[PDB]
Structure formats: structure tokens, C-alpha cells
Amino acid sequence: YQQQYNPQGGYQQYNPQGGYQQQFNPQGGRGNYKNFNYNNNLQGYQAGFQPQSQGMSLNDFQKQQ
Amino acid sequence: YQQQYNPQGGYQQYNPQGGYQQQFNPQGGRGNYKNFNYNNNLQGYQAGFQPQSQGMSLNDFQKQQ
Amino acid sequence: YQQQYNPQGGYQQYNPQGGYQQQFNPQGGRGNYKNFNYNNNLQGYQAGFQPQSQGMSLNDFQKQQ
Amino acid sequence: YQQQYNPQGGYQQYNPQGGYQQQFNPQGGRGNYKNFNYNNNLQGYQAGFQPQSQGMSLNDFQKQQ
Amino acid sequence: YQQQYNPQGGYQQYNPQGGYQQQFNPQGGRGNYKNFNYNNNLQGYQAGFQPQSQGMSLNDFQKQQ
């Protein structure tokens, strides 16, 4: 079993952009706001050696009883 | 079993863009807001060696009883 | 079993765009809003070696009882 | 068993666009809104070596009892 | 068993467009809205080596009992 990653040269720009500005933005409103959940996740790889790997794992969240 | 990844040269720009501005934006409203769940996830790979891998895994979320 | 990925040169721009601005945008409304779930997921690969891999897996979500 | 992917040169622009602006947009309305589920998923590959792979898998979601 | 993918040169623009603006847009209405499910999925491949692969798999969703 032989796994070989051998890059030569190259230009790599890794620029993921997440803009979350004013996620909660009511304008001129009247009322009540209860149980607001914001989950913002950014994950990634620039090149790299990662067999049998997992980027992001999320479970059991954002529940109201 | 032989796995070989050998890139030579090249220009790679990795620019995923997520815009979440004003996700919750009521304008001039009256009422009540309960149990708001926002799940924002960005994941990726620029090149890389990752056999038998998983990008993003999500389960058991956003439930109201 | 021989697997070989050997790219030479080339120009690759990876630019997926997700625009989620004002996802929830009532204008001049009256009422009640309960159990709003927004799932926004962006995932991908620019090049890369990933046999037997999975991009995104989601299960058991957005349920109201 | 021999699998060979060897691209030479070329110009590749990967630009999938998802516009989700004002997904929920009632204008001048009166009422009640309950159990709104929005699932927005964008996934893809620019080039890459991925035999026996799966892009996106989703099950068991958006149910009301 | 020999599988060979060797593209030379070429110009490839991958631009799938999904417009989901104002998916839910009642105008000047009165009533009640319950159990609204919107599933928006965009998936694809620009080039790439992927025998025995699956783009998108979805099951067991959008059910009301």
C-alpha cells in the first residue's frame, strides 16, 4: 500500500469568505424574540495529506422542547 | 495498491463566498418570533490527498417538539 | 491496483457563490412566526485526490412534532 | 486495474450560483406562520480524482407529525 | 482493466444558476400557513474522474402525518 502526494511548484490562494454581518437585524419592529440560535462554521484544507479524515461533524443541536 | 497525486505547476484560486447578511430582517412588523434556527456551514478542499474522507456530516438538528 | 492523478499546468478558479441575504424578510406584516429553520450548506473540492469519499451527508433534521 | 487522470493545461472556471435572497417574503399580510423549513445545499467538484464517491446524501428530514 | 482520462487544453465555464428569490411571497393575503418545506439542492461536476459515483441521493423527506 503506497500513497504518494508530491506537488511541485504552483500558486494556491485559499480565500473562503463568510459574511455574517447583521445576522439578526429587525428594523423598526415591536415584539418579543425568544430562542434564536445562529451556527456559523467555516472549515477547509489548503493542500495537505489527510486520508481517512473528516472535515466537520455536527450533531444534536438547535432543538426546542 | 498504488495511489499517486503529483501536480506540477498551475494557478488555483479557491474562493467560495457565503453571504448571510441580515438573515433575520423583518421591516416594520409587529408580532412574536420564537424558535429561529440558522445553520450556516461552508467546507471545502483546495487540492490535497484525502481518500476515504468525508467533507461535512450533520445529523439530529433543528427539531421542535 | 494503480491510481494516478498527475495534472500539469492549468488555470483553475473555484468560485461557488451562495447569497442568503434577507432570507427571512417580511415587509409591513402582522402576525406570529414560530419554528423557522434555515439550513445553508456549501461544500466542494478544487482538484484533489479523494477516492471512496463523500462530500456532504445530512440526515434527521427539520422536524416538527 | 489502472486508472489514470492526467489533464494538461486548460482554463476552468467553476462558478455555481445560488441566490436565496428573501426566501420568506410576505408583503402586507396578516396571519400565523408555523413550521417553515428551508434547506439550501450547494455541492460540487472542480476536476479531481474521486472514484466510488458520493456528492451529497440527505435523508429523513422535513417532516411534520 | 484500463481507464484513461487525459484532456488537453480547452476552455470550460461551469455556471449553473439557481434563483430562489422570494420563494414564499404572498401579497396582501390573510390566512394561516402551516408546514411549508422548501428543498433547494444544486450539485454538479466540472470534469473530474469519478467512476461508480453518485451525484445526489435524497430519500425520506417532506412528509406530513
Numbering used by the authors:
A (entry chain E), B (entry chain C), C (entry chain A), D (entry chain B), E (entry chain D): 69 to 133
Which lines from the publication concern this structure?
Yeast prions have provided an experimental system for obtaining a better mechanistic understanding of the prion strain phenomenon. Sup35 contains an N-terminal highly aggregation-prone prion domain (N or PrD) and a polar amino acid-rich region (M) (M124-D253). Interestingly, Sup35 can form distinct fibril structures, or polymorphs, that underlie distinct [PSI+] prion strains.
Cryo-EM analysis revealed that S17R37 formed a major polymorph, termed S17R37C, representing 70% of usable particles, and a minor polymorph, termed S17R37N, representing 20% of usable particles. S17R37C and S17R37N were both determined to resolutions of 2.4 Å. The S17R37C polymorph core spans the residues Y69-Q132, encompassing a longer core region than that in the S17R4C amyloid. The S17R37C backbone adopts an S-shaped fold centered around a long β-strand spanning the region K102-Q114. This result suggests that the N-terminal region in S17R37C amyloid is more dynamic and/or less compact than that in S17R4C fibrils. Additionally, the residues spanning N105-Q132 in S17R37C form inter-layer hydrogen bonds.
